[PDB]
Write a protein that binds this ligand. Structure first.
Ligand SMILES: Nc1nc2cc3nc(NCCc4ccc(C(=O)O)cc4)[nH]c3cc2c(=O)[nH]1
Ligand SMILES: Nc1nc2cc3nc(NCCc4ccc(C(=O)O)cc4)[nH]c3cc2c(=O)[nH]1
Ligand SMILES: [Zn+2]
Ligand SMILES: [Zn+2]
Lengths: 370, 370
């Protein structure tokens, strides 16, 4: 039987790693992409379809689920896995970001109170409890995603609060025996774009000790160059022997560059959301299927893609569906985009395993941005 | 290899029949329910899912497809079957009803001109041509669905025009060799609620000769009692040895009573449309899954239903999805409702085959309306 949590690195190339996380509900191949299932569904896909694309783990959200349908309700119904029909690992974000992104808020050292987009409360203790009620496999510490840009003073104050909250998150998780024995807890590094603060944050998190370490506070408007600059110094600060999770990233090229910088795990709404909007990922870059140029194009969305959508339907058909606002258009675009992302991750894993990831990254970029 | 068209009746009970229509693209078990795929998709379902529910044939619409994406376009792309990925029979309505239902129209003996809901034209010749371009397997004559209520004079004038159009439809279909050799043509009986006009219409259609005969002009607001009264005298007027198709019907009890009156084929948007709206069919009658009473109900939509949705997900989950406006809610409700309809048809076919359809109809009604 699989352990609660075990991360093993099978191969490395520079800062890049490939390996596996073993958990009770399944194995996660890294680097991993997690489709986002904010409201207990990966939008427009059955869980079996999510699995068919290659996903090993999906992401849920404490914030959304606590509002609808409710955390206690989901627990009464048997937990998130049973509720939505996904029996593999689920990582849940802690609310630390979504509350400030979506609500309409009172922040204090205790936590955050907010109006539902009714009054609600989050705190390290309540966040960890909600994630327990959901039956999350990977529980995220309750943090504060510092707005960007931030002054060094404000970034420091914010990060310091997040580190106090990280310790509270650790203690809350550990005090709940069933959770501590069956789930994993990841800490979240903050510090904005400042090396010294990132270092202090990493040191604080490592002192507390977590099963994995997220790089928080990025993909908040800073752009790729700056994100990569921050990753350059930030990822090496994290314990080498635990997974490194870059929250909310990203476009295919973001993922490739982040893996080059030591990231093992990703989540992003981009493939799902933009799929519904008509954007399809291809190895020659994204296309917008709504464009008139696709109205009579019999080719699949991507010429190499192995997904069921590309095996069966044309660009022309999907163009029609999306133009018409048909649900099947959302379904097909989403399945393809998530499959594309998983194929990207597979190519990344294989190339690192084979010691040719640098060449893959170069080839990928040359073609994607041709 | 299957013939262009062959209808065989395997068993009868009173006016009810069960049998098969063999066509080049597949066998259709009768009585049959055709899911509606107006815009080249059965809304929220992949064609494989439509097939998995038990459907042998689906319905498309000349009116919608001629507007978007265009009939000539679909022909250029290889026909409707290839375009949407359904390789089994497709019946297409002729436009005769939808143009007057949805457009904003100039009617004449030649046909109908109308504004797209751009100016367009339909006529017996153009309708048959569009259905050819789509590659329809069962082509419907271009008719006029008389509004309800109608005076006897207006119903007669309307029906007479439809019969002239039925002959034009026949001649247009026959003049197109590939269509005549590979597709079937059904005539549509009109005459409103008037026995003498229904008889005249049946006589006219039988004189022209068709592969099948639809009862048109019903499910236009007359209600079940009146519909059944009209069916009582109208269906026996049609040739016994050809399929009888009741257009646009209907609720489960409508279908049962119509089969009792000799109908072999049905189509209706009810299971798809109302599914997306939160109505689920069950053997104990319809439920609205949005209702708060389902928020923590772990039972499947229906206790006996064999569909994949009822095997896996709870009412509580689907309640959440529909409340949240999630696409997966539409998907699951629709798959279940279409599966329910197909199971109804299967029970009807089996009971007629076994000479216990009268008992089935009684048992069905007693429970459905308890
Ligand atoms: N707990 C926690 N969670 C986070 C989630 C994040 N998500 C992001 N970026 C997402 C950006 C984003 C937004 C929209 C789309 C799209 O619609 O395509 C894609 C990416 N940065 C994030 C930072 C944090 C963080 O520090 N702490
Ligand atoms: N060519 C032709 N086509 C028809 C289609 C029809 N469809 C109906 N009834 C549909 C009624 C209908 C409308 C909406 C819903 C729902 O949303 O649930 C269900 C049923 N009656 C109809 C009559 C004709 C006809 O004479 N000629
Ligand atoms: Zn694909
Ligand atoms: Zn069902």
């Amino acid at each position: 039987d699989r352990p609660r949590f075990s991360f093993s690195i099978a191969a490395r190339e520079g800062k890049a790693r490939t390996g596996t996380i073993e958990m009770k509900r399944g194995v996660i191949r890294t680097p991993a992409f997690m489709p986002v299932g904010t409201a207990a569904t990966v939008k427009a896909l059955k869980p079996e379809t999510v699995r068919a694309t290659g996903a090993d783990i999906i992401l849920g959200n404490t914030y959304h689920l606590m509002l609808r349908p409710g955390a206690e309700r989901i627990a009464k119904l048997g937990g998130l896995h049973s509720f939505m029909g996904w029996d593999r690992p689920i990582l849940t974000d802690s609310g630390g970001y979504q509350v400030m992104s979506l609500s309409s808020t009172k922040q204090s050292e205790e936590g955050v109170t907010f109006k539902s987009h009714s009054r609600h409360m989050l705190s390290p203790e309540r966040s960890i409890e909600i994630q327990h009620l959901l039956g999350s496999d990977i529980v995220m510490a309750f943090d504060e995603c510092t707005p960007y840009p931030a002054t060094p003073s404000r970034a420091a104050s914010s990060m310091e609060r997040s580190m106090r909250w990280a310790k509270r998150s650790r203690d809350a998780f550990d005090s709940r025996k069933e959770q501590a024995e069956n789930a994993a807890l990841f800490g979240i590094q903050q510090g904005s774009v400042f090396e010294n603060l990132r270092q202090q944050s990493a040191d604080a998190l490592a002192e507390i000790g977590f099963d994995g370490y997220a790089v928080g506070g990025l993909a908040v408007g800073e752009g790729q160059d700056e994100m990569f600059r921050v990753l350059d110094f930030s990822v090496p600060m994290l314990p080498d022997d635990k997974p490194h999770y870059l929250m909310g990233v990203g476009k295919p090229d973001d993922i490739v560059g982040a893996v080059e910088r030591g990231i093992d795990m990703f989540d992003c709404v981009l493939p799902t959301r933009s799929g519904r909007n008509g954007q399809a990922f291809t190895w020659d870059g994204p296309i917008n299927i709504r464009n008139a140029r696709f109205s009579e194009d019999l080719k699949p969305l991507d010429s190499e893609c192995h997904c069921a959508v590309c095996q069966k339907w044309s660009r022309a058909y999907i163009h029609h569906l999306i133009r018409a606002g048909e649900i099947l258009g959302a379904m097909l675009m989403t399945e393809h985009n998530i499959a594309f992302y998983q194929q990207l991750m597979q190519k990344i894993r294989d190339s690192i395993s084979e010691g040719r990831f640098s060449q893959f990254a170069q080839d990928f970029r040359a073609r994607y941005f041709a």
